[PDB]
Amino acid sequence: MCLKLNLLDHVFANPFMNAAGVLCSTEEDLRCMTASSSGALVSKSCTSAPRDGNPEPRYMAFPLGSINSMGLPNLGFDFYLKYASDLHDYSKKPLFLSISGLSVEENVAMVRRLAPVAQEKGVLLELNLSCPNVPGKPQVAYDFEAMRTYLQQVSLAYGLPFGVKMPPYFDIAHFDTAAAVLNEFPLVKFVTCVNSVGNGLVIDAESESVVIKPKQGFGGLGGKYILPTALANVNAFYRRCPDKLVFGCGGVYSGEDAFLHILAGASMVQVGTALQEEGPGIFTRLEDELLEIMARKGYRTLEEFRGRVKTIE
Amino acid sequence: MCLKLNLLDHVFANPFMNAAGVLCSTEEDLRCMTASSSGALVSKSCTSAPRDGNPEPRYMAFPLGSINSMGLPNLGFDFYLKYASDLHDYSKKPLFLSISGLSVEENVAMVRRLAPVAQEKGVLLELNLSCPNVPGKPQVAYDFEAMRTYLQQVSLAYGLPFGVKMPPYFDIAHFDTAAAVLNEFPLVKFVTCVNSVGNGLVIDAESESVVIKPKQGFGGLGGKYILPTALANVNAFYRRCPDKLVFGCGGVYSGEDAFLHILAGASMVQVGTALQEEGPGIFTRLEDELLEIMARKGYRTLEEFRGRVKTIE
Ligand SMILES: Cc1cc2nc3c(=O)[nH]c(=O)nc-3n(C[C@H](O)[C@H](O)[C@H](O)COP(=O)(O)O)c2cc1C
Ligand SMILES: Cc1cc2nc3c(=O)[nH]c(=O)nc-3n(C[C@H](O)[C@H](O)[C@H](O)COP(=O)(O)O)c2cc1C
Ligand SMILES: O=C(O)c1cccc(CCc2c(C(=O)O)[nH]c(=O)[nH]c2=O)c1
Ligand SMILES: O=C(O)c1cccc(CCc2c(C(=O)O)[nH]c(=O)[nH]c2=O)c1
User: Which member of B131, B193, B241, B249 is catalytic?
Assistant: First the structure.
């Protein structure tokens, strides 16, 4: 029985990795994720300049998942580029670098500088499109023309295979439109579904108060709340983007949750909230649990079941 | 006690009602809701003509909620109109009729017929903006120009105060645009937030299969999965629509959940999945539990806390 994967010209011991934003902001974090039994890691979404992010409390977790409005706190692109170029031990596992510029121009500037390092060290780009552009306009991936512009500009500036981190969608028309945009861009080799379910609101009954300070308490949802939404998006894009990989993210707490992602179409499986809550020991548990389901079903490899969710009649 | 309230020129014993679609399709279902302890009832969303809906299984529930692709099965507008005109006992509680035509013209045709009944009997209209997927275009409430058309045309045709059933939004710019549309229409006196979270996908690990037959397993999510989404939409519209009422729907299983909806801004609180799962006895329990939380906090009225969720700093 094996969890090994080969994609994007890299080898991966197993499909599990952190989700961007979790356990990946500092050099300490990235060393920790490297030391863990995950098959890969991704660095925190970065901007050109370092950011403090939003005031605290800006993350909170609960039995059914988490809410956050972190505000993109990060150490700045130069830091993550140096990590990828000089610090990361690529003999341990592959590295993804997540970028999330606040304008197309900022993204272009970063990718131009990433490219030689991607070429020479093999660091892989994850471009976060589930992010803000202009206040009063929707996030980029919810604005299809903006999304097309970002991908045209980053494809030209980078010129190397990359992937994109997508928000969840809720309307089949959006699945159709979004996947068609992505399919215009041959350098988009993987699609990560999904980022948080946007602008939820958690209220504490006792205090009668929201639980995060930014945005009057509104923030992105992760965790148990979002698994079916995550699965739908993985499968929607898996069906619609046959020449790309899909990575799954959302609601993974167990090997069974990972198995469901993989049946939906996931290649890599990212872990956000559950990793935030449990710490990097989760990876050995998820590995064991996934191998146990495979053994019971007689599956020897991931490809024997990836994308093989059955439909009814 | 007591949880009695007045809205929309009607008196309600308590703020609870079924969510459209649950326990409200047949005359039997409507008489069952009327006999319950709910403060109101709403009928199944109807078309001009009867519909069988989609193939079974088309609804499934789980510990965290439900998924459905019912396909708008209903007995047709003439049936619900006759129920409102002739069979409903308005001495028991108010009745809302939900309408979900597949075009503007079909809604206009139904609402012109409903108007005299509304005048004579006081039946209330909930206009459902969600609809079956049509390839090439989004649902009506995710197309702000189509939504504006629908409300212009229904406003003109109906001429009386009515409400609208909204899908969830996930983006602050969308809240701003949708609320601005709604505020163009003075006859829209209530907004019901939210319909199911669209196009989720539940997979059964043992069978390696989706759990509903239509749409390759994709369907709307309700229950525990969607409470924070529902609260955010309730509050977003409560803040943006000061001259309207907001009705909360999504994730209510307990009086605590109702309390959170009301803190967010809800006037009425609708119950879908938990009603489907527990049956109409749930209303006595929700009432008792809400009144118990009120008493422990010192609240004598719903108005003392409606909309009074606290923010940080
Ligand atoms: C604290 C926190 C920080 C996050 N920061 C990022 C980020 O910087 N870039 C991004 O692509 N996603 C970010 N996310 C989203 C996660 O990557 C992930 O898509 C989402 O949490 C869903 O997965 P989950 O259900 O495992 O949490 C963040 C999530 C959390 C909880
Ligand atoms: C079986 C079923 C049928 C539904 N049919 C309708 C409908 O006809 N019209 C409507 O506006 N919403 C309909 N809904 C959505 C619910 O009214 C409600 O918005 C949703 O289930 C979220 O509430 P909950 O979390 O309490 O389930 C239906 C929901 C279910 C589960
Ligand atoms: O700066 C923000 O307001 C903001 C809001 C939503 C998303 C982002 C991008 C970074 C990010 C964050 C974050 O840093 O808030 N949180 C998530 O759950 N996913 C993400 O992609 C930034
Ligand atoms: O026929 C459908 O695929 C469909 C999809 C979404 C919405 C509707 C309208 C009726 C409805 C249904 C339904 O009857 O399937 N289910 C819900 O959760 N909300 C609803 O508003 C019908």
Answer: B131
Give the domain ranges of chain B.
1-53+72-196+223-313, 54-71+197-222
| Declared resolution, Å | 1.7
Q: What is the distance between the alpha carbons of residues A153 and A160, in angstroms, rounded to a whole number?
A: 13
Q: Can you tell me the distance from the alpha carbon of A97 to that of A83, in angstroms, rounded to the nearest whole number? A: 9
Find how far residue A249's CA is from the centre of its chain: 6
Spatial distance between the Cα atoms of A145 and A142, rounded to a whole number of angstroms: 9
Please name the fold of domain B54-71+197-222: Dihydroorotate Dehydrogenase A; chain A, domain 2 (2.30.26)
Strands B218-222 and B65-68: antiparallel
Residue A20: nearest ligand to its CA? Answer: 1
Method: X-ray
Which chain B residue has its CA at the smallest distance from A210's CA? B311
CA-to-CA dists, residue B283 to A102, B24, B40, B271, B310, angstroms: 48, 15, 11, 9, 27
> Domain B1-53+72-196+223-313, what fold?
TIM Barrel (3.20.20)
Token digits for A181? 């945009």
Query: Which residues, judged by CB distance below 6 Å to any ligand atom, belong to the binding site of ligand 2?
Result: B 19-22, 44-45, 59, 66, 68, 70, 98, 128, 165, 195-196, 222-223, 226, 249-252, 271-274, 276
**Residue A171, both tokens:** 């309307």
For ligand 1, the distance from its centroid to the CA atom of residue A18, given in whole angstroms, is 9
CA of B116 to the centre of ligand 2 (A): 27
- Among A23, A67, A196, residue to substitute to test ligand 1 (most atoms within 8 Å of Cβ): A196
